[PDB]
Amino acid sequence: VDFLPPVGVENREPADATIREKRAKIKEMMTHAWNNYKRYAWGLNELKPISKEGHSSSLFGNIKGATIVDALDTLFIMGMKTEFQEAKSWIKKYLDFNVNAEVSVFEVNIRFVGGLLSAYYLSGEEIFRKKAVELGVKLLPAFHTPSGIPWALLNMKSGIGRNWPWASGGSSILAEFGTLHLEFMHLSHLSGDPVFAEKVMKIRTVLNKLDKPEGLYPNYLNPSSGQWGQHHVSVGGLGDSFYEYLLKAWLMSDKTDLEAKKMYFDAVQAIETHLIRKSSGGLTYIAEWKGGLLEHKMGHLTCFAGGMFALGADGAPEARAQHYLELGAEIARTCHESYNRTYVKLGPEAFRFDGGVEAIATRQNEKYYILRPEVIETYMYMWRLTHDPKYRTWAWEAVEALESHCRVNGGYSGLRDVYIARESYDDVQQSFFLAETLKYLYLIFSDDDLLPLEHWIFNTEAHPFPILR
Numbered sequence: 031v032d033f034l035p036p037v038g039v040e041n042r043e044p045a046d047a048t049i050r051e052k053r054a055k056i057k058e059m060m061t062h063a064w065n066n067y068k069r070y071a072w073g074l075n076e077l078k079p080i081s082k083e084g085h086s087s088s089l090f091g092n093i094k095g096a097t098i099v100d101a102l103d104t105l106f107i108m109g110m111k112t113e114f115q116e117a118k119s120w121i122k123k124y125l126d127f128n129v130n131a132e133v134s135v136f137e138v139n140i141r142f143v144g145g146l147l148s149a150y151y152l153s154g155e156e157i158f159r160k161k162a163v164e165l166g167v168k169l170l171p172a173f174h175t176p177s178g179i180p181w182a183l184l185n186m187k188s189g190i191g192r193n194w195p196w197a198s199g200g201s202s203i204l205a206e207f208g209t210l211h212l213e214f215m216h217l218s219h220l221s222g223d224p225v226f227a228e229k230v231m232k233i234r235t236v237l238n239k240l241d242k243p244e245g246l247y248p249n250y251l252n253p254s255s256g257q258w259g260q261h262h263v264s265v266g267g268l269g270d271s272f273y274e275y276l277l278k279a280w281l282m283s284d285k286t287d288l289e290a291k292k293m294y295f296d297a298v299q300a301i302e303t304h305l306i307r308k309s310s311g312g313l314t315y316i317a318e319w320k321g322g323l324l325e326h327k328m329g330h331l332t333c334f335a336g337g338m339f340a341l342g343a344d345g346a347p348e349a350r351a352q353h354y355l356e357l358g359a360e361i362a363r364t365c366h367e368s369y370n371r372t373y374v375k376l377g378p379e380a381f382r383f384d385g386g387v388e389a390i391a392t393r394q395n396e397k398y399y400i401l402r403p404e405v406i407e408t409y410m411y412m413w414r415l416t417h418d419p420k421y422r423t424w425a426w427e428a429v430e431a432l433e434s435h436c437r438v439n440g441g442y443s444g445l446r447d448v449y450i451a452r453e454s455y456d457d458v459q460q461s462f463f464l465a466e467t468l469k470y471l472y473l474i475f476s477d478d479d480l481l482p483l484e485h486w487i488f489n490t491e492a493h494p495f496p497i498l499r
């Protein structure tokens with residue numbers, strides 16, 4: 031009910047000079063992304079760094095300031111105190127949730143609810159707690175369906191929701207409704223109202239009543255009927271953070287959510303048996319599965335699973351702890367190869383395992399890189415759980431690639447084709463570059479006890495939450 035000073039936020043300079051200098055560079059990258067956001071797009075959701083103006087994704091409806099809220103905890107942990115205060119003052123005056131238009135429930139939960147929650151737990155500023163709970167209340171009508179599986183889209187003023195127009199069968203998407211759990215548990219903790227926890231616990235009850243085809247989770251679930259939609263399974267986009275939040279719910283509960291633990295380890299065993307394959311060149315990858323038929327392609331989004339597997343190792347029964355650490359390392363290696371086999375040295379959105387080269391994209395519309403964090407995210411977990419220096423080496427390769435190819439005068443831009451020398455800027459500075467990509471890089475080159483994993487569970491937008499006991 032009452033704020034306690036956060037554990038593990040004391041930020042010490044690393045003892046090795048090269049590590050200090052590398053981390054200082056990452057802070058300089060955040061200063062570049064933030065200062066240009068403020069110069070050209072202050073109060074708008076994202077920055078267009080080439081056009082030097084705002085970018086307003088329809089995922090956020092009429093809410094403002096996504097980059098401000100997403101950046102709060104990164105600014106705080108990097109010691110950017112003046113910037114943190116300037117963000118806080120904007121939030122107090124201008125962050126407004128009583129607006130028309132539809133928002134993505136998933137996106138607003140992971141970025142706005144999550145970003146405000148972390149800012150509160152780090153700083154103790156009650157405005158963040160007040161705003162997080164206000165937004166949580168506004169999201170409750172998304173769960174007003176026969177099954178309790180929430181709508182994808184919600185008009186927060188009218189409380190009326192619907193699913194994505196082109197969603198397969200009108201279904202709700204597994205990663206979207208499956209990635210509410212951590213935030214809603216903290217909303218119940220801080221508000222004292224059990225309504226929030228009950229909403230996400232009901233999602234569990236629905237899932238556990240269903241037969242899982244081959245132990246796998248389809249990415250589509252119909253909220254009107256509570257039955258599966260199309261039997262498309264992926265540990266990348268549309269599925270991934272559901273699995274992530276099974277593991278993290280167990281950890282964030284101080285390992286008391288035994289249902290989450292069983293769901294997670296059952297799910298990962300089925301993923302290993304049905305989805306995980308080895309290429310002829312010896313690379314481990316996680317394929318997509320459509321009604322039983324594997325497609326031997328892996329996504330940049332799927333690369334988060336390396337860190338997920340490793341993070342789940344200590345809880346697993348031995349000798350599967352070492353098995354999960356080694357599986358996480360093999361995913362990390364494959365994702366590093368997908369990075370290293372491009373021209374720019376940042377990996378494509380999806381990469382295939384057929385000749386003539388492995389771990390490369392061939393489809394033109396899959397060669398892009400939109401500043402995504404998942405490979406660096408996996409490097410961070412592997413570094414913290416193994417301290418193998420190659421994870422810092424691989425992280426620094428990504429830093430140099432970002433600086434050579436994504437840094438522009440007006441911020442950071444994504445790329446359309448990581449396989450060509452000529453620049454191909456998409457002119458969007460994604461807010462998750464500041465929330466996630468730069469935060470995980472900064473943590474990689476920090477000591478282990480800055481946001482130590484023993485006490486902090488990262489939400490899927492890299493917003494750290496304390497363990498609930």
Ligand SMILES: CC(=O)N[C@@H]1[C@@H](O)[C@H](O[C@@H]2O[C@H](CO[C@H]3O[C@H](CO[C@H]4O[C@H](CO)[C@@H](O)[C@H](O)[C@@H]4O)[C@@H](O)[C@H](O[C@H]4O[C@H](CO)[C@@H](O)[C@H](O)[C@@H]4O[C@H]4O[C@H](CO)[C@@H](O)[C@H](O)[C@@H]4O)[C@@H]3O)[C@@H](O)[C@H](O[C@H]3O[C@H](CO)[C@@H](O)[C@H](O)[C@@H]3O[C@H]3O[C@H](CO)[C@@H](O)[C@H](O)[C@@H]3O[C@H]3O[C@H](CO)[C@@H](O)[C@H](O)[C@@H]3O)[C@@H]2O)[C@@H](CO)O[C@H]1O
Pocket residue numbers: 086087088089136140194195196197198203205206266267268269270271331395402403462466490491
């Ligand atoms: C095969 C196919 O196309 N299937 C479709 C499904 O993919 C769709 O499911 C989701 O739909 C959501 C809504 O999609 C609509 O809106 C978005 C957003 O548009 C607004 O924002 C953007 C960005 O600022 C802006 O550019 C726009 O102007 C607008 O303001 C649009 O992008 C969508 O447009 C695409 O889809 C249309 C219809 O499907 C097409 O008509 C369009 O031409 C366009 O196609 C593009 O995308 C296709 C799908 O990949 C692709 O086939 C095509 O070649 C082209 O590239 C649409 O209008 C989406 O928001 C949602 O997106 C998520 O998943 C995709 C697919 O993996 C990711 O690429 C994407 O980045 C999102 O991933 C996050 O969210 C998912 C859960 O939704 C998580 O599982 C995932 O982990 C990601 O979450 C992490 O992301 C960050 C880090 O990377 C960070 O936030 C954090 O770490 C998160 O954890 C899906 O696409 C379905 C319903 O629309 O329709 C099917 O047809």
Ligand SMILES: *[C@@H]1O[C@H](CO)[C@@H](O)[C@H](O)[C@H]1NC(C)=O
Pocket residue numbers: 370371
């Ligand atoms: C990465 O690619 C370069 C070629 O650009 C190669 O020399 C190097 O060995 C590769 N790294 C690994 C770990 O294979």
Ligand SMILES: [La+3]
Pocket residue numbers: 271334490491
């Ligand atoms: La994520």
